[PDB]
Design a binder for this molecule. Structure first.
Ligand SMILES: CCCCCCCCCCCCCCCC(=O)N[C@@H](CO)CSC[C@@H](COC(=O)CCCCCCCCCCCCCCC)OC(=O)CCCCCCCCCCCCCCC
Lengths: 736, 172, 12
C-alpha cells in the first residue's frame, strides 16, 4: 500500500512511504520523521512492528525539543516504555552548527519522561577531539536536581601546585542534600571536603567538614604545626518565625596555619579567627532576653588568645508608654569572661629564644578573667513637633566586677606598686540632650522634582569622671572618629570604659528625596566641642602609661576633627560614597575615603569600581607591648582598589583588579583574566597575584607573594549547578 | 536658600493604617519599624487593606583595607532590606529595597571589642534602614495604592481570561 | 549530576 507526497500517519511522517506485510515488518522509506511529545527522530528508513510497538530509524538524527538536545545515531529504536535507543549515538546541547562538545557512546538510551540519559562506551569530545573516556555515563535531559558528578575546577597556585576538584553531589531529598569535594593538590595531597545542607519548617543550616593528610613539610617544626589537617562546623538558624530563635555559627580547625595553607578563596587578608557561637534569643514585644555562648579559635600564632563569653545573658527592653509621654528603658547584662593563655616559650636547640608567644606579653591586670554585671536604666522625655524635637535623657550606669587574677599578674602588679581589687563597682549617671530642626525645600534637577531637606542637630552630653584604670578591658574598643561619633553617649564600645564627657555635638545633614520617597543623595557635616579634657583612656593610652613607656594627642583639645560624609546615586546607574575627617588642632587628615561604583541597568555586565581609603587614627591593641596603642606608622591605611568587568565583544568579557598600598609601596593583589560564554559552553580563566597571610617559625607576622591560575570550563547541558569566591568578594557587582 | 520649617501637613503620613510583617517575624528591625510607624500616626493592624512585607534582610561583611602584614584591618558591614507592598488577594503592588553600609576598624587582638563595635554599627544601620523605609511609606497615598491594586487586579483577571481563552481555543 | 536549591516535598 504505497503512498507519496506529504505522507502522514506516536506519528510517523515522511515525504515517501510504502507500507508492507501484515503481522510482519511494516517498513517506511524516504525523509522519515518519527515524532512524539518533545521527541523527534529523522532519517532515511524506518521499520515498525504492530500498531503499537517497535520503531527503528536508520541513519538517524534526533532532537529533544524542551531541552536544547540533539544527536545522531547509526540507528534508533523505540520500544514499549518510549525508551528510545541509539547505536553509535551522539548527545549534545550545542546548536546544529556547533561541535563544541559531544558525548559519543556505543549505546545511548533516552527517557524524556524521566529526564535521564545514559551512554555505554562513552567518549566526551571537545571539537571532535576525544578528551575523556568512561564505560558508562548518565546525564540529565531536563534540568531537575539529580545526583552525580558536578563540573570540575582546575587551578594551579603556589601553596598547592596543580589542583583538581571533581565534586560529587548526593541529591538525598528535596529539602536536604550533600556534596563531596575531593581536592587533589599536587603539592600537599588528597583533601576531602563535605557539606550537608538542610531545610525544615523551623530550621535551616549547613554542616561542613574537611580532612587532608598534608605531605608539605614547609611548616614542620613551626609552633602548633599539624600533619593532619581538618575542619568541621555548623551554621544553623531556628525559629525566624518564632519568638524563640536559636542560632549556631560554630567552626573548629586543626592547626593555626589551616587557612594560610589550604585556602586561597578568602582573598587578601585571609582570616585570623573563626567563630564558635550559639545563641538562644527570646523576642517579646517590648523586651529581648538572650543567652549567648560565644568563643573564637585563632587561625594564627601571632595574635593574643581572645576572651570568651561562656554565659552572656542579657535582658533589654522598655515599658509601654503613652504617646508624647515619658519613656523608661532598661538594659541588663551578666557575662563570664574566661581565657586560657598559651604563653609557652619556644627555645632553639640551645637556650637561645627563637620566638615569643604573644600571650606572654600580657602583664598584670591584662591577665584577668571574671564576671561582670551591668545594669543601665534610663528615662527620657521626647518632645516632638512637625519641625523639630528636644529629647532629654537621664541614665544610670552600675557595673560590678568579680575578678580573678593568676599568680604572675599579681606579682607584676606589686612590682609596679599596685594592688589587685578582685571586687570592683562603678556607678555613674549620664545626661544627654538631643535636639534638632527639620527644614524642607522643593527643587527641580534635570526636570525631575527633588525635595531637599535640611536637618541640623545638637546633642549635649554629660558623664562624670571616675578613675577606671583599676579595671581590665574585656569587650571594649575605641572607635575611630566619624560623623556617627557625634551622637554616641560613649566614645568607647563595650562596658569596661565609660568616657568622661562634658561636650556638645553640632551637625547638619541635607538629603535629596524623589517623589516616591527614594533618596538620591546625602551630605553631612559636624563637629564636637569639648568643655573638659578626656581622661578616661584605654590601658597604655592614659597619662600614667604614656610616661611609663615614654611617648608623646587627642587628649586636651577643645574640638573634635571635622567630620564630612556624603552619598550620591546617579539614576539607577552608578554610585559614589565619601567621608573625610580633618583635625584642625593638627592640620592633618585623620581618615577618609572615596568609593565609586558603576554598573548600569541597561547592561549589568559593565562594572567599574574605584576606591581610595586613608586612615591614620586607629587605636589597636599591641601584641608586643601588651597594651593599646594609637600611632601605628606601619598600619596606616593609604590604599586604592580598582576592579573592572567589561564586555569587549557581546560574548566575551574581561575582568581585572588591582589593589595597591602606598604606605609600603607594594601591590596587595592584582589579577586579570577573561570569561567567554556561548550557547553550550562557558570558560573562565584568571591569572592572579596576591600577598597571603603568613606566620613564620619565629612567631613574627609576615606575608608571602602567591601567584595563581584558575580555570573552569563548563559544558552547559552536561550537569552543573543552579545557584569562585575571591572573584565574588573582590569585585563589587559580580552578580548576573 | 528657600528652606522652610517642616509643617504638620508635610510630616504626617496620609496613610492611617497598614499591616507590617517580616520573614524574621519578631526581629528587631520589624519590631522597631512598627514602633516608629505607630509613633507617626499610622495604626499597625493586620486588618489593614495593604501589607508591608520585609521579605529579606541580608547582613554582609567585606574586608576593604589591610594591615601592614596583609591582614584584614577594616570591615565594611552592608545591611540590605528587600520589601514588598502587597494588596489583597496576595497581589504584590510594589517591590524594592533599601541598603546602608558602614565601615569600622577591626582589631585582631581584641575580638569581643571588635564584635561590640560591629554590633553598635549594626544597630545604627538598623535605624538608618528603618527611616528610609518610612520615607518611602510617607510618599505613598491610599489613592496611589488603591489605583495600583485596581490596575494589577484587572491585569490578573485579564490574564486569567486570556488563558482560559487559549484553553478553549486549543481544546479542539 | 545536577545540584539546585532546597525546597519542600509536594504533599498529595
Ligand atoms: C578503571 C575502569 C573501571 C570503570 C569506572 C566506572 C565508571 C562508572 C560510574 C560512573 C557513572 C557516573 C557518571 C554519572 C555522570 C553524572 O552524574 N553527571 C555528568 C556530568 O555533570 C557527566 S560528565 C562528568 C563530568 C565531571 O567532570 C568531573 O568531575 C570528572 C569526574 C571523574 C572524577 C573521579 C575520578 C576518580 C577515579 C580515581 C579513584 C579511582 C581508583 C582507580 C582504580 C582504577 O565531566 C564533566 O561534565 C566536566 C568535564 C568538562 C571539562 C572538559 C575540559 C577539557 C579540556 C579543554 C580543551 C581540551 C582539548 C580541546 C583542544 C583540542
Amino acid at each position: 500500500a504505497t503512498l507519496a507526497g506529504d505522507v502522514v500517519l506516536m506519528q510517523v511522517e515522511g515525504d515517501e512511504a510504502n507500507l508492507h506485510q501484515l503481522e510482519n515488518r511494516g517498513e517506511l522509506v524516504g525523509n522519515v520523521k518519527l515524532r512524539d511529545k518533545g521527541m523527534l527522530v529523522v532519517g532515511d528508513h524506518a521499520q515498525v512492528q504492530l500498531d503499537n510497538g517497535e520503531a527503528q530509524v536508520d541513519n538517524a538524527e534526533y532532537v529533544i525539543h524542551k531541552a536544547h538536545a540533539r544527536g545522531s545515531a547509526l540507528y534508533a529504536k523505540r520500544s514499549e516504555n518510549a525508551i528510545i535507543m541509539l547505536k553509535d549515538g551522539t548527545y549534545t546541547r550545542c546548536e546544529p552548527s556547533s561541535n563544541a562538545w559531544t558525548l559519543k557512546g556505543n549505546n545511548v538510551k533516552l527517557n524524556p519522561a524521566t529526564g535521564f540519559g545514559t551512554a555505554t562506551n562513552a567518549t566526551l569530545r571537545v571539537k571532535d577531539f576525544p578528551v575523556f573516556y568512561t564505560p558508562y555515563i548518565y546525564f540529565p535531559i531536563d534540568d531537575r536536581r539529580q545526583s552525580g558528578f558536578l563540573p570540575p575546577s582546575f587551578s594551579s597556585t603556589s601553596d598547592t601546585g596543580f589542583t583538581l576538584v571533581t565534586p560529587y553531589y548526593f541529591n538525598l531529598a528535596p529539602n536536604y542534600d550533600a556534596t563531596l569535594y575531593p581536592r587533589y593538590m599536587a603539592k600537599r595531597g588528597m583533601m576531602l571536603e563535605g557539606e550537608f545542607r538542610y531545610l525544615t519548617h523551623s530550621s535551616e543550616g549547613i554542616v561542613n567538614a574537611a580532612y587532608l593528610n598534608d605531605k608539605d613539610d614547609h611548616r614542620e617544626g613551626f609552633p602548633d604545626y599539624s600533619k593532619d589537617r581538618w575542619l568541621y562546623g555548623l551554621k544553623n538558624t531556628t525559629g525566624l518565625d518564632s519568638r524563640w530563635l536559636a542560632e549556631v555559627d560554630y567552626t573548629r580547625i586543626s592547626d593555626p596555619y589551616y587557612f594560610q595553607d589550604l585556602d586561597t578563596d578568602l582573598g587578601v587578608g585571609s582570616t585570623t579567627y573563626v567563630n564558635q557561637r550559639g545563641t538562644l534569643t527570646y523576642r517579646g514585644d517590648t523586651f529581648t532576653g538572650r543567652l549567648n555562648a560565644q568563643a573564637y579559635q585563632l587561625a594564627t600564632t601571632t595574635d593574643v588568645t581572645p576572651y570568651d563569653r561562656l554565659p552572656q545573658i542579657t535582658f533589654d527592653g522598655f515599658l509601654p508608654y503613652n504617646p508624647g509621654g515619658m519613656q523608661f528603658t532598661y538594659g541588663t547584662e551578666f557575662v563570664r569572661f574566661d581565657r586560657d593563655l598559651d604563653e609557652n616559650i619556644y627555645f632553639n636547640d640551645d637556650g637561645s629564644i627563637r620566638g615569643k608567644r604573644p600571650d606572654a606579653s600580657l602583664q598584670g591586670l591584662a591577665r584577668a578573667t571574671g564576671d561582670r554585671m551591668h545594669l543601665e536604666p534610663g528615662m527620657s522625655l521626647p518632645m516632638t513637633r512637625s519641625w523639630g524635637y528636644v529629647t532629654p535623657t537621664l541614665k544610670y550606669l552600675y557595673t560590678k566586677y568579680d575578678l580573678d587574677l593568676d599568680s604572675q599578674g599579681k606579682t607584676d602588679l606589686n612590682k609596679r606598686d599596685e594592688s589587685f581589687d578582685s571586687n570592683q563597682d562603678r556607678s555613674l549617671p549620664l545626661v544627654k540632650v538631643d535636639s534638632g530642626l527639620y527644614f524642607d525645600r522643593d527643587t527641580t534637577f534635570a526636570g525631575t522634582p527633588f525635595r531637599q531637606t535640611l536637618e541640623p542637630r545638637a546633642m549635649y552630653l554629660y558623664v562624670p569622671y571616675k578613675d577606671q584604670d583599676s579595671l581590665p578591658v574585656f569587650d571594649t574598643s575605641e572607635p575611630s572618629f566619624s560623623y556617627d561619633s557625634l551622637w554616641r553617649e560613649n566614645r568607647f564600645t563595650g562596658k569596661d570604659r565609660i568616657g568622661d564627657a562634658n561636650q556638645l555635638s553640632l551637625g547638619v545633614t541635607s538629603r535629596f528625596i524623589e517623589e516616591n520617597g527614594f533618596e538620591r543623595a546625602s551630605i553631612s557635616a559636624g563637629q564636637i566641642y569639648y568643655f573638659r579634657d578626656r581622661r578616661v583612656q584605654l590601658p597604655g593610652l592614659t597619662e600614667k602609661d604614656l610616661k611609663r613607656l615614654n611617648l608623646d594627642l587627642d587628649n586636651d583639645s577643645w574640638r573634635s576633627p571635622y567630620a564630612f560624609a556624603g552619598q550620591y546615586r546617579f539614576n539607577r546607574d552608578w554610585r559614589i560614597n565619601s567621608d573625610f575627617n580633618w583635625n584642625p588642632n593638627t592640620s592633618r587628615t585623620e581618615s577618609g575615603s572615596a568609593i565609586f561604583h558603576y554598573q548600569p541597568e541597561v547592561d549589568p555586565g559593565k562594572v567599574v569600581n574605584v576606591g581610595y581609603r586613608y586612615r591614620a587614627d586607629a587605636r589597636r591593641f599591641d601584641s608586643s607591648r601588651g597594651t593599646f596603642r594609637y600611632g601605628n606608622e606601619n598600619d596606616i591605611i593609604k590604599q586604592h582598589d580598582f576592579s573592572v568587568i567589561w564586555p569587549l565583544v557581546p560574548q566575551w568579557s574581561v575582568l581585572a583588579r588591582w589593589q595597591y598600598d602606598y604606605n609600603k609601596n607594594r601591590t596587595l593583589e592584582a589579577f586579570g583574566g577573561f570569561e567567554y560564554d556561548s550557547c553550550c559552553w562557558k570558560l573562565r580563566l584568571i591569572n592572579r597575584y596576591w600577598l597571603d597571610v603568613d606566620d613564620d617559625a619565629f612567631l613574627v607576622q609576615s606575608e608571602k607573594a602567591d601567584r595563581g591560575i584558575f580555570l573552569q570550563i563548563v559544558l552547559k547541558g552536561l550537569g552543573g549547578i543552579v545557584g569562585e569566591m575571591f572573584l565574588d568578594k573582590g569585585i563589587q557587582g559580580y552578580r548576573q | 536658600c528657600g528652606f522652610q520649617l517642616r509643617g504638620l501637613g508635610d510630616a504626617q503620613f496620609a496613610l492611617k493604617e497598614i499591616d507590617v510583617s517580616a520573614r524574621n517575624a519578631y526581629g528587631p528591625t520589624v519590631r522597631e519599624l512598627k514602633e516608629t510607624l505607630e509613633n507617626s500616626g499610622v495604626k499597625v493592624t493586620s486588618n489593614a487593606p495593604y501589607h508591608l512585607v520585609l521579605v529579606r534582610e541580608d547582613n554582609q561583611q567585606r574586608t576593604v583595607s589591610y594591615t601592614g602584614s596583609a591582614r584584614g584591618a577594616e570591615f565594611e558591614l552592608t545591611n540590605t532590606i528587600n520589601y514588598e507592598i502587597v494588596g489583597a488577594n496576595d497581589l504584590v503592588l510594589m517591590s524594592n529595597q533599601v541598603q546602608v553600609q558602614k565601615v569600622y576598624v577591626h582589631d585582631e587582638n581584641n575580638l569581643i571589642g571588635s564584635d561590640q563595635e560591629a554590633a553598635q554599627l549594626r544597630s545604627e544601620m538598623r535605624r538608618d534602614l528603618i527611616q528610609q523605609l518610612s520615607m518611602r511609606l510617607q510618599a505613598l497615598t491610599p489613592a496611589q495604592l488603591d489605583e495600583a491594586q485596581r490596575q494589577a487586579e484587572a491585569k490578573a483577571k485579564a490574564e486569567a481570561e486570556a488563558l482560559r481563552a487559549a484553553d478553549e481555543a486549543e481544546r479542539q | 549530576g545536577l545540584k539546585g536549591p532546597l525546597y519542600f516535598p509536594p504533599a498529595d
